[PDB]
Amino acid sequence: PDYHEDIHTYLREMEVKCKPKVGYMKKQPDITNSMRAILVDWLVEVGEEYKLQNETLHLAVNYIDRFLSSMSVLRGKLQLVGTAAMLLASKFEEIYPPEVAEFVYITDDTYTKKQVLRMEHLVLKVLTFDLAAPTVNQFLTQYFLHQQPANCKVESLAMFLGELSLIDADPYLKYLPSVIAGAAFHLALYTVTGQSWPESLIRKTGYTLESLKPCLMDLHQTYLKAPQHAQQSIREKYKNSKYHGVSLLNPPETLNL
């Protein structure tokens, strides 16, 4: 269709403007990567509970990392930042966002409605209302259009892998959404069918397989280590029949790169 190339070009611009500061965690005095991991895993569950789009999750993670790029947050307020970000993402992305009352209830009354509504206003202030961010998801949906024929296991697996990268800020904050999406597509394609990053996508993205290697090295490791990981919600989510049970598939032992 008529706009696919323009939109890609423009999402490629925006991802660079929308990226968080890569080492912001080192300058956070209370919160850690493990804490951010526990929070993102929690939001996976919240999204499963409220039947939210994968996109809504991806957006929320973007808003959280950008918020924490410029704002020092104590551990006891991290979940408040996450909850207001989930709320904003939902209002942005969902046909039916959950109400503030349900957001308050899934935190088990850790925070008040007021506190959620006041964090919402802070997050919008800090993000200067710039909520429409490219995500690994958005790149992945476009890349799917280059698989012949459409393979639903490859699609579920690439998403599963794209979602795994959200949990771990070291190393994945280093990588743009379009890169993680390419690495995820390739890895999924390779695991399911033995195929590789297609020539049509090398042309569209300008990313050679080689250029994807650093992120693919990482993501292969994350895949291999996935059942051993302390955060397990994405793997649970991806056992269900709607995702063809792809988290139960065996990762490939080597990539040949």
Binding site: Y10, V100, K114, L117, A132, L145
Partner: protein, 296 residues
Amino acid sequence: MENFQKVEKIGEGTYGVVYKARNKLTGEVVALKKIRLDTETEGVPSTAIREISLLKELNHPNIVKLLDVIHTENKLYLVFEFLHQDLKKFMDASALTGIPLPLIKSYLFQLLQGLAFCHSHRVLHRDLKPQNLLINTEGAIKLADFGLARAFGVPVRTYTHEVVTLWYRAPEILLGCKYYSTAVDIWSLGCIFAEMVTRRALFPGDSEIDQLFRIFRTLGTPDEVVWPGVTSMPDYKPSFPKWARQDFSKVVPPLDEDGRSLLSQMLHYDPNKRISAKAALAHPFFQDVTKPVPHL
């Protein structure tokens, strides 16, 4: 916010009330869109969130300019450039004389420009009707009201069904299609194009079935040749009267051969065969185009 002196209410544009106001220090005339946050409600409305984030990246001469966002605990104001009137009112004032065609042609060309900018930045307007389109004294026309707008993905997902003001609503929404995209906005512009030409609304329905039938009565009831898949759409009924298509010479009499070509392309039943705003800009109807001034 004490830098503004309110001049008058100039309407309730949808989910906000709009005021004309003046900056007391620079003298700038602005439109204010007041969005109350009650208290202990749902927070910032999802329509304000969308409108602001989408508008912040829709910077085009044919899209209304957001100048500021004033963000209190108690209230939320959007500050816009001020434009003279909306197209609905301009059209009502011209109900007797008629809009001159070089200006109809200028306005549509501009609308398509602003719309193509939206689409190529992954935005669906979803509410293009004459009252949401703004004009100034120097012959510019701009897209406004992005409250009902949406950042879309490639390929699209299912989005809200309750979308587009009935008269300007596309058949694929009315027939309950699972997916709609940018074509719903072209549809709306085609109806606006026709309305500028004939001085009245092309399809002024009062219920969904009535909106559909008026569409069918003008353009023919669609079949599988005209639109592969229609007879399989959720709200399609094989009992629909099968009306033949009206010649555009009766439909839109004041219009030339090029005018009819473009209009029929904007009103194609098949959303996939319906002309894009980019392709529309390249149509022979615009070979001739100038930038005339409105005649109040």
